[PDB]
Ligand binder design. Structure first.
Ligand SMILES: OC[C@H]1CNC[C@@H](O)[C@@H]1O[C@@H]1O[C@H](CO)[C@@H](O)[C@H](O)[C@@H]1O
Ligand code: NA
Ligand code: NA
Length: 367
């Protein structure tokens, strides 16, 4: 019953959205960022994942990241080669997995990265001096997407559906498109242009658009108002997402574990209520406990609070962030386990739950 904002979406893209809308009541898809690219202790293998090394299964949802594509780089900001990324997207999709993409766009004004707060949104939007730059940046995604296509025996082109999740965590102040660096109206203009350009001008038909504020900057006494800061309108969003690392044990959060569990459930309950009111689908688009320091994290801090409330449980998927490779990145950072990591057995339990689906037990999402 939810309908995509692209009324002409490909059959496979329509099917994915419809099937997520059906599956969400009884199930939760598990996702991992950069899951096939590397893990904490390995890089180079062309078909491997830390998640699979622990559980025997790939994640159901594969997250990927485009930052640097817009500058013509051959690899993204975490050194993931774009040609390999296209291969991995196609491989995951061929197995029935779901694809989602974020984009830590570099700062066009300074040439710095997404964390360089030099103002740029006002320049990029329609009427802005750098509007040609926004078009050029988006054109690089159009080209990347073409490298995901196949053409069948009848001459018809097919693509993997993509849950495209741009301009994320915009209620935070850490990215240049965030609060304090861009006005609310200019952010909305940026989002609306992104959709008009990709869906209407460029006629991409394989996208599902996900909106994803950060929970850590939402007042829980006024959740809906905070969630809807910068919301561009129902004609511009398909997935009512949320990045919530706060209620799952973030080091800076002084709330007790019991308060945090309750807040996780409440955040997802309200997310789902917003999605229901709008005819959309909700998802926990980013979460996790960096370095997996919390005993029984998966069952006690993630699955338990989601399953505690029937509204909260109607999220369609949950994705955790990447497993950075220690040999080349000096800051230890990971959100899924690897063999021998302390939470590995609890992650097996999470996988084993009847609620949680990894790639190996997905129904056919694309018909
Ligand atoms: O803390 C984990 C996430 C939370 N969401 C914002 C994101 O920037 C952050 O992780 C960083 O992600 C970038 C892009 O992949 C990466 O370069 C950094 O090293 C962090 O993983
Ligand atoms: Na669900
Ligand atoms: Na399961």
């Amino acid at each position: 019953l939810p309908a995509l904002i692209d009324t002409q979406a490909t059959a496979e893209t329509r099917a994915l959205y419809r099937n997520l809308a059906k599956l969400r009541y009884k199930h939760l898809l598990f996702g991992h960022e950069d899951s096939l690219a590397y893990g904490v202790h390995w890089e180079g293998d062309m078909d491997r994942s830390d998640v699979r090394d622990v559980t025997g299964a790939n994640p159901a949802v594969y997250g990927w990241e485009l930052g640097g594509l817009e500058l013509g780089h051959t690899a993204n900001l975490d050194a993931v080669n774009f040609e390999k990324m296209q291969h991995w997207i196609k491989a995951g999709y061929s197995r029935g997995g779901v694809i989602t993409i974020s984009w830590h766009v570099f700062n066009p004004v300074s040439g710095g990265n997404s964390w360089d707060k030099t103002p740029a949104v006002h320049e990029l939007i329609p009427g802005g001096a750098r509007h040609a730059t926004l078009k050029a940046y988006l054109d690089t995604f159009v080209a990347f997407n073409e490298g995901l296509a196949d053409v069948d025996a009848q001459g018809n082109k097919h693509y993997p559906p993509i849950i495209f999740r741009p301009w994320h965590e915009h209620n935070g102040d850490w990215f240049w498109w965030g609060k304090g660096h861009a006005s609310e109206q200019d952010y909305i203009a940026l989002w609306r242009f992104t959709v008009h350009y990709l869906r209407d001008e460029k006629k991409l038909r394989n996208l599902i658009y996900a909106y994803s504020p950060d929970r850590s900057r939402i007042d829980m006494a006024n959740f809906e108002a905070g969630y809807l800061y910068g919301y561009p309108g129902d004609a511009y969003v398909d997935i009512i997402g949320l990045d919530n690392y706060w209620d799952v044990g973030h080091e800076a959060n002084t709330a007790s574990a019991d308060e945090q569990k309750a807040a996780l459930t409440a955040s997802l309950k309200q997310l789902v209520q917003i999605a229901r009111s709008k005819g959309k689908i909700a998802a926990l688009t980013e979460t996790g406990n960096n370095r997996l320091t919390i005993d029984n994290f998966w069952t006690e801090r993630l699955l338990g609070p989601i399953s505690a409330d029937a509204d909260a449980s109607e999220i369609a998927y949950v994705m955790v962030w990447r497993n950075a490779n220690l040999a080349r990145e000096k800051s230890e950072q990971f959100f899924a386990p690897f063999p021998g990591q302390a939470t590995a057995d609890d992650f097996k339990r999470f996988y084993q739950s009847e609620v949680v689906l990894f790639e190996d037990e997905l129904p056919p999402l694309y018909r």
